[PDB]
Amino acid sequence: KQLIEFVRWSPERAQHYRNKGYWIDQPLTRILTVGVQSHPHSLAIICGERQLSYIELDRLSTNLATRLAEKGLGKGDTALVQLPNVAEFYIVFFALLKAGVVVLNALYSHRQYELNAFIKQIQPKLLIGSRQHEVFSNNQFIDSLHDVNLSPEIILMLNHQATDFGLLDWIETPAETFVDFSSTPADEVAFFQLSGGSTGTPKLIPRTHNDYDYSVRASAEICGLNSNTRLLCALPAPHNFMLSSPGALGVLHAGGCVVMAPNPEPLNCFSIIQRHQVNMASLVPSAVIMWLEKAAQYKDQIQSLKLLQVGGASFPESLARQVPEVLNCKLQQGFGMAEGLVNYTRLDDSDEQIFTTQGRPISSDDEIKIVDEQYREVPEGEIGMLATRGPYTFCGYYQSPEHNSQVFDEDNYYYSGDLVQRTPDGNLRVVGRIK
Ligand SMILES: Nc1ccc(C(=O)O)c(O)c1
Ligand SMILES: [Ca+2]
Ligand SMILES: [Ca+2]
Ligand SMILES: [Ca+2]
Ligand SMILES: [Ca+2]
Ligand SMILES: [Ca+2]
């Protein structure tokens, strides 16, 4: 009965964000619904040899949602999902959003310790994973949960065994009996994001439909997505970068197509890019270097690339200038965080801006503060600590009142720990990290 707890925006701000059009109080399923009404047959996801249209995605995620509601799973409940970069990931995501289950998506590289900390935290009633994952190769992990009354009520397995509940079986056919189900309220938690750079296990970040949808819609505008965008998803699908800035959600919002790749392996990525004429991709600097090493020998397979998003680490100007030259495509530099703030160079910015800065905030109502150790605003140009608050920046970690009072100040600015400086053109440059 009780919806998931989280820290809220002040009503004064919540009104402002509604008045400005940022929060439109719609569930994240809006992306699916709106898509099925306009272009039900456009391809939504390409995965290997499979072609999922928008209405194909809608029907499949409904089948799963009706069977979860049939089992009594809905509002108030949580789910732990750990799937690889395949179409099933997005079916599950939209299926849980439809059913009102707050999902935490672990990284497919997370091992037993991390998954254990997540379960002890959200106490999920549903667990979706892969039998091909090391943790679910045997039954030791699933068994250890019973000893601590943390075992879930429903466990679905991809690449399942005869005994297991086949995830693909629950997706193909809907349930026999009818049960009503609905998303959580737009201004309530939709799912959990995972912090990056956390010393211990990643901390939980509650994302509501209102704020996440906004970052998706705004990211899509600044990154130029449209119904012809074919975006390669080579990074980990659950990551904020690959999902919402602009990510798969931004592409679907624009009526485009998501092309799945197991990882950013140059040769495989290059082949997928040529096969499906991928015209956009999003990478971290380490993967870009991998692509740069192989590009010259495979210029033809990657001709169709039109725009590359690079963010998430140091990207020196000497590397930036190689993207257009070697990868034959435009460069967009970004700097974001799962906690909220997302920065991007604009597609019309100068070459000096694109090649030596990480852009500027998505929202004109993103409030930025650059301070020193005496928590005072530094003179424009100098390096300082980044504090921010906006219409898509969280207001505190899940069930972490001690930590939250350390990273949030009285005015509720969030201190990312990132060191930055504001260039004359107004753009930000990320120059280091602090702790
Ligand atoms: N747009 C982006 C880029 C990078 C990150 C990141 O935290 O790695 C993000 O959360 C958003
Ligand atoms: Ca099909
Ligand atoms: Ca559109
Ligand atoms: Ca090109
Ligand atoms: Ca060239
Ligand atoms: Ca951080």
UniProtKB/TrEMBL annotation:
Binding-site residues for Ca(2+) 3, renumbered to this chain: G72, D77
UniProt domain AMP-dependent synthetase/ligase: residue ranges: 36-398
One BP annotation, GO: siderophore biosynthetic process
Residues the record lists as binding Ca(2+) 4: D169
Residues annotated as binding Ca(2+) 1: Q51, E56
EC number: 2.7.7.58
Alphabetized UniProt keyword annotations: Calcium, Ligase, Metal-binding, Nucleotidyltransferase, Transferase
Keyword Lyase in record: no
Pathway, per record: Siderophore biosynthesis
Protein residues bound to Ca(2+) 2: G72
Keyword Ligase on entry: yes
Residues reported in the UniProt entry to bind Ca(2+) 6: S416
Binding site for Ca(2+) 5: Q303, L305, N328
Annotated GO MF terms: 2,3-dihydroxybenzoate--[aryl-carrier protein] ligase; metal ion binding; nucleotidyltransferase activity
Protein name: (2,3-dihydroxybenzoyl)adenylate synthase
Part of the full-length chain shown: 3 to 437 of 542
